[PDB]
Coordinates of C-alpha atoms in Angstrom, one line a residue:
Chain A
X1 CA 0.0 0.0 0.0
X2 CA 2.3 2.8 1.3
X3 CA 4.5 1.4 -1.4
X4 CA 1.5 2.0 -3.9
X5 CA 1.6 5.6 -2.9
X6 CA 5.3 5.9 -3.3
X7 CA 5.4 4.1 -6.6
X8 CA 2.9 6.8 -7.8
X9 CA 4.4 8.9 -10.6
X10 CA 5.7 12.3 -9.5
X11 CA 4.1 15.3 -11.2
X12 CA 6.2 17.3 -13.6
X13 CA 6.0 21.1 -13.5
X14 CA 8.0 23.9 -15.3
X15 CA 6.9 27.5 -16.0
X16 CA 7.6 29.6 -19.1
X17 CA 9.8 32.7 -19.5
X18 CA 6.2 33.7 -20.2
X19 CA 4.5 33.0 -16.9
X20 CA 2.3 29.9 -17.4
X21 CA 3.2 26.9 -15.3
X22 CA 3.0 23.6 -17.2
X23 CA 2.5 20.5 -15.1
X24 CA 0.9 17.1 -15.5
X25 CA 1.0 13.5 -14.5
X26 CA 1.8 10.5 -16.8
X27 CA 0.3 7.0 -16.9
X28 CA -0.3 4.2 -19.5
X29 CA -3.7 5.5 -20.4
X30 CA -4.5 6.1 -24.1
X31 CA -6.9 8.8 -23.1
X32 CA -6.2 11.9 -21.0
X33 CA -7.5 15.3 -20.3
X34 CA -5.8 18.7 -20.4
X35 CA -6.8 22.2 -19.3
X36 CA -5.9 25.8 -18.5
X37 CA -6.9 26.8 -14.9
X38 CA -7.2 30.6 -14.6
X39 CA -6.9 32.3 -11.2
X40 CA -10.0 34.1 -12.4
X41 CA -13.4 34.3 -10.8
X42 CA -16.3 36.4 -9.5
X43 CA -14.3 37.5 -6.5
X44 CA -12.3 39.4 -9.1
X45 CA -15.4 41.2 -10.3
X46 CA -16.7 44.6 -9.5
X47 CA -20.1 46.1 -8.7
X48 CA -20.7 46.6 -12.5
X49 CA -18.1 44.1 -13.5
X50 CA -20.0 41.2 -11.8
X51 CA -21.1 38.4 -14.1
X52 CA -18.4 38.7 -16.9
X53 CA -16.4 35.7 -15.8
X54 CA -19.6 33.8 -16.4
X55 CA -21.1 35.5 -19.4
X56 CA -17.6 34.7 -20.5
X57 CA -17.5 30.9 -19.7
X58 CA -20.6 31.0 -21.9
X59 CA -18.9 32.3 -25.0
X60 CA -15.6 30.6 -24.3
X61 CA -16.8 27.8 -26.6
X62 CA -19.0 29.5 -29.2
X63 CA -15.7 30.2 -31.1
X64 CA -12.6 32.2 -31.8
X65 CA -11.6 34.5 -34.7
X66 CA -9.1 31.9 -36.1
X67 CA -11.9 29.3 -36.3
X68 CA -15.5 30.5 -35.8
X69 CA -18.3 28.5 -34.1
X70 CA -19.5 25.8 -36.5
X71 CA -15.8 24.9 -37.0
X72 CA -14.4 24.8 -33.5
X73 CA -17.2 22.6 -32.3
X74 CA -17.0 20.6 -35.6
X75 CA -13.2 20.3 -35.0
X76 CA -13.8 19.3 -31.4
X77 CA -16.8 17.0 -31.9
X78 CA -15.1 15.5 -35.0
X79 CA -12.1 14.4 -33.0
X80 CA -14.1 13.0 -30.1
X81 CA -12.7 15.3 -27.4
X82 CA -14.8 16.7 -24.5
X83 CA -14.2 20.4 -23.8
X84 CA -15.9 21.3 -20.5
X85 CA -15.3 23.7 -17.7
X86 CA -16.5 26.1 -15.0
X87 CA -15.9 29.4 -13.2
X88 CA -16.2 29.7 -9.4
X89 CA -15.3 32.7 -7.2
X90 CA -11.6 32.4 -7.3
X91 CA -11.1 29.6 -9.9
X92 CA -12.0 29.1 -13.5
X93 CA -10.8 26.4 -15.8
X94 CA -11.2 24.9 -19.3
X95 CA -10.3 21.3 -19.8
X96 CA -10.5 19.0 -22.7
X97 CA -10.2 15.2 -22.8
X98 CA -8.9 13.5 -25.9
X99 CA -6.8 10.4 -26.7
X100 CA -3.4 12.0 -25.8
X101 CA -2.7 11.5 -29.5
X102 CA -4.0 15.1 -29.5
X103 CA -2.0 16.9 -26.8
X104 CA -0.7 19.4 -29.4
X105 CA -4.1 19.7 -31.0
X106 CA -6.0 20.0 -27.7
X107 CA -3.4 22.4 -26.4
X108 CA -3.7 24.7 -29.4
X109 CA -7.4 24.7 -29.0
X110 CA -7.1 25.7 -25.4
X111 CA -4.8 28.6 -26.2
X112 CA -7.1 29.7 -29.0
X113 CA -9.9 30.2 -26.4
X114 CA -8.2 31.7 -23.3
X115 CA -6.8 34.2 -25.8
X116 CA -9.0 34.7 -28.8
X117 CA -12.7 34.4 -28.3
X118 CA -15.1 35.4 -31.0
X119 CA -17.2 37.3 -28.6
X120 CA -19.5 37.7 -31.5
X121 CA -21.6 40.7 -30.5
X122 CA -24.5 38.8 -32.1
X123 CA -23.6 35.6 -30.2
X124 CA -23.5 37.6 -27.0
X125 CA -27.0 39.2 -27.3
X126 CA -28.3 35.6 -27.4
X127 CA -26.2 34.1 -24.6
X128 CA -27.4 37.1 -22.7
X129 CA -31.0 36.0 -22.6
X130 CA -29.7 32.4 -22.3
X131 CA -28.1 33.1 -19.0
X132 CA -31.0 35.2 -17.8
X133 CA -33.0 32.0 -18.2
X134 CA -30.3 29.6 -17.1
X135 CA -30.1 31.8 -14.0
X136 CA -33.8 31.6 -13.4
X137 CA -33.2 27.9 -13.3
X138 CA -30.2 28.0 -10.9
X139 CA -32.7 29.8 -8.7
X140 CA -35.1 27.1 -7.7
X141 CA -32.2 24.8 -6.9
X142 CA -32.7 25.7 -3.2
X143 CA -29.8 23.3 -2.7
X144 CA -27.6 26.1 -4.0
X145 CA -29.3 29.5 -3.5
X146 CA -28.9 28.6 0.2
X147 CA -25.1 28.6 -0.3
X148 CA -24.8 31.9 -2.2
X149 CA -27.0 33.5 0.4
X150 CA -24.6 31.9 2.9
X151 CA -21.8 33.6 1.1
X152 CA -23.9 36.7 0.7
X153 CA -24.1 37.2 4.5
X154 CA -21.1 35.2 5.6
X155 CA -18.8 37.6 3.7
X156 CA -21.3 40.5 3.4
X157 CA -19.9 43.6 1.8
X158 CA -16.8 42.1 0.2
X159 CA -16.0 40.4 -3.2
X160 CA -16.8 36.8 -2.3
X161 CA -20.4 37.8 -1.3
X162 CA -21.1 38.4 -5.0
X163 CA -22.4 35.2 -6.6
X164 CA -20.4 33.6 -9.5
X165 CA -23.4 34.2 -11.6
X166 CA -23.9 38.0 -11.0
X167 CA -27.0 40.1 -10.9
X168 CA -29.6 40.1 -13.6
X169 CA -29.1 43.8 -14.2
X170 CA -25.4 43.2 -15.2
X171 CA -26.1 40.2 -17.4
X172 CA -28.8 42.3 -18.9
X173 CA -26.3 45.1 -19.7
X174 CA -22.8 43.7 -20.0
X175 CA -21.0 45.2 -23.1
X176 CA -19.2 43.5 -25.9
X177 CA -16.4 45.3 -24.3
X178 CA -16.6 44.6 -20.6
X179 CA -16.2 40.9 -21.5
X180 CA -13.0 41.6 -23.3
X181 CA -12.2 44.0 -20.5
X182 CA -12.4 40.9 -18.3
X183 CA -10.5 38.5 -20.6
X184 CA -7.5 40.8 -21.3
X185 CA -7.4 41.7 -17.6
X186 CA -7.3 38.3 -15.9
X187 CA -6.6 35.7 -18.6
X188 CA -2.8 35.8 -18.2
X189 CA -0.2 33.1 -18.2
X190 CA 1.2 34.0 -14.7
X191 CA -2.2 33.2 -13.3
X192 CA -3.0 30.4 -15.8
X193 CA -1.9 26.7 -15.5
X194 CA -1.6 24.1 -18.2
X195 CA -2.1 20.8 -16.5
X196 CA -2.9 17.3 -17.9
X197 CA -3.0 13.6 -17.1
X198 CA -3.0 10.4 -19.1
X199 CA -0.4 9.0 -21.4
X200 CA 1.3 12.4 -22.2
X201 CA 5.1 13.0 -22.1
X202 CA 5.6 16.3 -20.4
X203 CA 8.2 17.6 -22.8
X204 CA 5.9 17.1 -25.7
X205 CA 3.3 19.1 -23.8
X206 CA 5.7 21.9 -22.8
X207 CA 6.9 22.5 -26.3
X208 CA 3.3 22.6 -27.6
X209 CA 2.3 25.1 -24.9
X210 CA 5.7 26.7 -25.1
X211 CA 4.6 26.7 -28.8
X212 CA 0.9 27.9 -28.8
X213 CA 1.3 30.2 -25.8
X214 CA 3.6 32.6 -27.5
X215 CA 3.0 35.2 -24.8
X216 CA 5.5 38.0 -24.1
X217 CA 5.7 40.0 -20.9
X218 CA 7.2 43.5 -21.2
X219 CA 6.5 45.4 -18.0
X220 CA 7.2 44.2 -14.4
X221 CA 3.4 44.4 -13.9
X222 CA 2.5 41.7 -16.5
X223 CA 4.9 39.4 -14.7
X224 CA 3.2 40.1 -11.3
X225 CA 0.0 38.5 -9.9
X226 CA -2.2 40.9 -7.8
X227 CA -3.2 39.6 -4.3
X228 CA -6.8 40.1 -3.5
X229 CA -8.6 42.4 -1.1
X230 CA -9.3 40.6 2.2
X231 CA -13.0 39.7 2.7
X232 CA -14.5 40.5 6.1
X233 CA -16.3 37.5 7.7
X234 CA -19.5 38.7 9.3
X235 CA -21.2 36.4 11.8
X236 CA -24.8 36.9 10.8
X237 CA -27.8 35.4 9.2
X238 CA -30.0 35.8 6.2
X239 CA -33.5 34.3 6.1
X240 CA -35.4 34.0 2.9
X241 CA -38.6 32.4 4.3
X242 CA -41.3 30.8 2.3
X243 CA -43.5 28.2 3.9
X244 CA -44.7 27.7 0.3
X245 CA -41.7 25.4 -0.2
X246 CA -41.6 21.6 0.4
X247 CA -38.9 22.2 2.9
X248 CA -36.3 24.5 4.3
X249 CA -32.6 24.4 3.9
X250 CA -30.1 25.6 6.5
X251 CA -26.4 26.3 6.2
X252 CA -24.3 27.7 9.0
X253 CA -20.6 28.1 9.1
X254 CA -17.5 29.7 10.7
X255 CA -14.6 31.4 8.9
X256 CA -12.2 29.0 7.1
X257 CA -8.4 29.4 7.2
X258 CA -7.5 29.4 3.5
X259 CA -5.8 26.7 1.4
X260 CA -2.4 27.5 2.7
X261 CA -3.0 26.7 6.3
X262 CA -1.7 23.3 7.4
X263 CA -4.7 22.9 9.7
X264 CA -7.1 22.5 6.8
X265 CA -6.0 18.9 7.2
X266 CA -7.0 18.1 10.8
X267 CA -10.0 20.2 10.0
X268 CA -10.8 18.1 6.9
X269 CA -10.5 15.1 9.2
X270 CA -13.0 16.9 11.4
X271 CA -15.7 16.9 8.7
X272 CA -14.8 13.3 8.2
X273 CA -16.2 12.4 11.6
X274 CA -19.7 13.8 11.3
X275 CA -19.8 13.4 7.5
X276 CA -23.2 13.4 5.7
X277 CA -26.5 11.6 5.6
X278 CA -29.2 11.3 3.0
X279 CA -32.3 9.1 3.4
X280 CA -31.2 6.6 0.7
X281 CA -28.1 5.4 2.6
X282 CA -29.0 2.3 4.7
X283 CA -27.9 3.0 8.3
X284 CA -29.6 4.0 11.4
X285 CA -26.7 2.0 12.5
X286 CA -24.1 4.3 10.8
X287 CA -20.6 4.8 11.9
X288 CA -20.0 7.3 14.7
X289 CA -21.3 10.2 12.5
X290 CA -24.1 10.5 15.1
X291 CA -25.4 13.4 13.2
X292 CA -26.1 10.6 10.8
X293 CA -27.4 8.1 13.3
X294 CA -29.5 10.6 15.2
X295 CA -30.6 11.9 11.9
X296 CA -32.1 8.5 11.4
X297 CA -33.5 7.6 14.8
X298 CA -35.4 10.9 15.2
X299 CA -35.8 11.4 11.4
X300 CA -34.0 14.7 11.6
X301 CA -33.2 15.5 8.0
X302 CA -33.7 14.6 4.4
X303 CA -30.0 15.1 4.0
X304 CA -27.1 16.9 5.6
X305 CA -23.5 17.5 4.5
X306 CA -20.4 18.9 6.1
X307 CA -18.1 21.2 4.1
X308 CA -14.8 23.2 4.4
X309 CA -15.1 25.2 1.2
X310 CA -12.0 27.2 1.3
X311 CA -10.3 29.9 -0.8
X312 CA -7.0 31.8 -1.2
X313 CA -7.0 33.5 2.2
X314 CA -10.4 32.8 3.7
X315 CA -13.0 29.9 4.0
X316 CA -16.4 28.5 5.1
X317 CA -16.3 25.6 7.5
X318 CA -19.8 24.5 8.2
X319 CA -22.7 22.2 7.5
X320 CA -25.8 22.2 5.5
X321 CA -29.0 20.3 5.9
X322 CA -32.4 19.9 4.3
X323 CA -35.4 19.1 6.5
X324 CA -39.2 19.1 6.8
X325 CA -40.7 22.4 8.0
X326 CA -41.1 20.6 11.3
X327 CA -37.9 19.0 12.4
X328 CA -35.6 21.9 11.5
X329 CA -34.9 22.7 15.1
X330 CA -34.1 19.3 16.7
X331 CA -31.7 19.0 13.8
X332 CA -29.7 22.1 14.3
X333 CA -29.6 21.4 17.9
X334 CA -28.4 17.8 17.5
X335 CA -26.0 18.9 14.7
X336 CA -24.6 22.1 16.1
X337 CA -24.2 20.0 19.2
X338 CA -21.9 17.7 17.3
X339 CA -19.5 20.4 16.5
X340 CA -19.2 21.0 20.2
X341 CA -18.7 17.3 21.0
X342 CA -16.3 17.3 18.1
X343 CA -14.0 19.8 19.6
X344 CA -14.7 19.3 23.3
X345 CA -14.6 15.5 23.7
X346 CA -13.7 13.7 20.5
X347 CA -11.9 10.3 20.7
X348 CA -9.1 8.5 19.0
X349 CA -11.2 5.6 18.0
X350 CA -13.2 8.2 16.1
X351 CA -10.4 10.1 14.4
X352 CA -9.0 6.7 13.4
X353 CA -12.0 6.1 11.1
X354 CA -12.2 9.7 10.1
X355 CA -8.7 9.6 8.7
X356 CA -9.3 6.3 6.7
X357 CA -12.5 7.8 5.5
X358 CA -10.6 10.8 4.2
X359 CA -7.8 8.6 2.9
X360 CA -10.5 7.0 0.8
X361 CA -11.8 10.2 -0.6
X362 CA -8.2 11.4 -0.7
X363 CA -7.5 8.7 -3.2
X364 CA -10.8 8.6 -5.0
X365 CA -10.5 12.4 -5.3
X366 CA -8.0 11.4 -8.0
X367 CA -10.1 8.9 -10.0
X368 CA -9.4 9.1 -13.7
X369 CA -7.7 11.7 -15.9
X370 CA -10.0 14.7 -15.8
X371 CA -10.1 14.7 -11.9
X372 CA -6.3 14.3 -11.6
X373 CA -5.8 17.3 -13.8
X374 CA -8.2 19.1 -11.6
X375 CA -5.9 18.8 -8.6
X376 CA -2.9 19.6 -10.6
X377 CA -4.8 22.5 -12.1
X378 CA -5.8 23.5 -8.6
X379 CA -2.8 22.4 -6.4
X380 CA -0.4 24.7 -8.2
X381 CA -2.8 27.6 -8.5
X382 CA -3.8 27.8 -4.8
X383 CA -1.1 25.8 -2.9
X384 CA 1.9 26.7 -5.0
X385 CA 2.8 23.2 -6.2
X386 CA 1.4 19.7 -6.2
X387 CA 0.5 17.8 -3.1
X388 CA 1.3 14.0 -3.6
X389 CA -1.0 11.4 -2.2
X390 CA 2.1 10.3 -0.4
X391 CA 2.2 13.7 1.2
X392 CA -1.5 14.3 2.0
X393 CA -1.1 10.9 3.5
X394 CA 1.4 11.9 6.2
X395 CA -0.4 15.3 6.6
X396 CA -3.5 13.5 7.7
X397 CA -2.0 10.2 8.8
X398 CA -0.6 12.1 11.7
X399 CA -3.7 13.8 13.1
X400 CA -4.6 12.6 16.6
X401 CA -7.7 13.2 18.7
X402 CA -6.2 15.9 20.7
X403 CA -5.2 17.5 17.4
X404 CA -8.7 17.6 16.1
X405 CA -10.0 19.0 19.3
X406 CA -7.3 21.7 19.4
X407 CA -8.3 22.6 15.8
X408 CA -12.1 22.6 15.5
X409 CA -12.4 24.4 18.8
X410 CA -9.9 26.9 17.5
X411 CA -12.3 27.7 14.6
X412 CA -15.7 26.8 16.1
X413 CA -15.8 27.3 19.9
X414 CA -17.7 30.5 20.8
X415 CA -17.3 31.8 17.3
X416 CA -20.0 33.9 15.6
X417 CA -21.3 31.7 12.7
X418 CA -23.2 32.7 9.6
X419 CA -26.5 31.0 9.0
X420 CA -28.5 30.9 5.9
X421 CA -32.0 29.5 5.5
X422 CA -34.6 29.5 2.7
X423 CA -37.9 27.8 3.1
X424 CA -40.5 27.1 5.8
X425 CA -38.1 27.9 8.7
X426 CA -40.5 29.4 11.2
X427 CA -39.2 26.7 13.4
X428 CA -35.5 27.8 13.3
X429 CA -34.9 29.8 16.5
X430 CA -33.3 33.3 16.4
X431 CA -29.5 33.8 16.2
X432 CA -28.6 34.3 19.8
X433 CA -29.9 30.9 20.3
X434 CA -28.1 29.1 17.6
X435 CA -25.3 31.3 18.7
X436 CA -25.1 30.2 22.3
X437 CA -25.1 26.8 20.6
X438 CA -21.5 27.5 19.9
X439 CA -20.3 27.0 23.5
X440 CA -20.7 23.8 25.4
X441 CA -22.0 24.1 29.0
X442 CA -18.8 22.2 29.9
Chain B
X1 CA -37.7 54.2 67.4
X2 CA -35.4 52.5 64.9
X3 CA -32.0 51.4 66.0
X4 CA -31.3 50.1 62.6
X5 CA -31.1 53.7 61.3
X6 CA -27.4 53.8 60.4
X7 CA -27.0 50.1 59.6
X8 CA -30.1 50.7 57.5
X9 CA -28.7 53.6 55.5
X10 CA -25.2 52.2 55.1
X11 CA -27.0 49.3 53.6
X12 CA -29.0 51.6 51.5
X13 CA -25.7 53.1 50.3
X14 CA -24.4 49.8 49.0
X15 CA -27.8 48.9 47.6
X16 CA -27.6 52.0 45.6
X17 CA -24.1 51.2 44.3
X18 CA -25.2 47.8 43.2
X19 CA -28.2 49.2 41.3
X20 CA -25.8 51.7 39.8
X21 CA -23.4 48.9 38.8
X22 CA -25.8 46.0 38.1
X23 CA -28.6 47.6 36.1
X24 CA -26.3 49.1 33.5
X25 CA -24.5 45.8 33.1
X26 CA -27.7 43.9 32.5
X27 CA -28.9 46.8 30.3
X28 CA -25.9 46.2 28.0
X29 CA -26.7 42.5 28.2
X30 CA -30.3 43.3 27.3
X31 CA -29.3 45.4 24.4
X32 CA -26.4 43.2 23.4
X33 CA -28.9 40.4 23.1
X34 CA -31.6 42.4 21.3
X35 CA -29.3 44.0 18.7
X36 CA -29.9 40.9 16.8
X37 CA -33.4 42.4 16.3
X38 CA -32.7 46.1 16.7
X39 CA -30.2 45.8 13.9
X40 CA -32.2 43.4 11.6
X41 CA -33.7 44.3 8.2
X42 CA -36.7 43.1 6.2
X43 CA -37.5 42.9 2.5
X44 CA -40.3 41.4 0.4
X45 CA -39.1 39.6 -2.7
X46 CA -42.0 37.8 -4.5
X47 CA -41.2 36.5 -8.0
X48 CA -43.5 39.1 -9.7

């Protein structure tokens, strides 16, 4: 096993005199996947600039000037490659997955987008009303709105608080320009990463990137990556009630450390211990995760999940559950209680499993090519380099009970959390109450 | 008629210094706790 980790192929990385960092992992695999992961997002958007990164993602495929729509797609389809991607708050990417026999072809394609997007003013005015609809859809996904609102209040006033999607008013008025104003501003090599995994031979990649990414940095600026304005965490709540809904969602959380921080490990292990439930499972007998157990015994929630969504310099360590208009309270109580237990009297026998549970997701986090690239894509971008499963291993193969306690308490005990809840929540008690739920009557 | 006199006023003294000290304290506490509401803000957002 440990030998399995060790025998795992190191990841190659080397940047350009340009700025791009080119890394990737090699295997036997005929197939592969490759992508450019920009340090771009919504967080990087303004009050009138909010949306672009998206409105963008949405035209990032409809063509380039070199090869308009019908052709790009036709060139992509025709070769059997899958060009997919996203755009978060501090992370955007565009990956393709071909047969490795296309590294140089995929790579070019990549470059031709991140650099030259048609942005056909006529293509835009359509994607405009497309998003405005696609947004109206994102909307009844209470499973999400509940998170944005969480951000909305959790980081109220700052850049994170703005949703990756952006207000309707902006998407209704973004200019042919503003998009380009976004592209040319953030889409730069120093903040972009060319990563891939499959059967590829690094050098061949390099040269192709080093070949299609003929970027040239004059000024000292161009070679420098701006650090972002710190976002003020604001223990508070935001309630979008509506007893008209099947059920209510609740999401509460404390400020997260930020990728960098070594504790995100022990912390990650934390979330391992209470994990998540979801009525389909098969376990009123579940592992320690009482939140799970108790969730069953007393039919607390339809589903609950723990999360340590983190960013560059901040984060959101919490939990989110969905429950009938009626059992909302008992749930919080039982749940929030767990946090306490967690960082007041957690045991070794517990952390033991936690770890292994993480070590399982730790591994399965890297299941295939696309996913591997993700980490590489990410790793570098947010951490600085690539964290080997051999490393993560030790990182979290050395977290003892007393360490979890010391950690969670450090970020949960008597901290002012941010709660978010849409739906028939008449039953969720005020703040003070869920607030004094942060300290255990030890 | 009332030997307690002194003992009774001295007492009164202290009693007055506690009110002085205690009531504000709990006043903060009362406000501290209500701010959640005093602060608060509504908004009606139907779909149209």
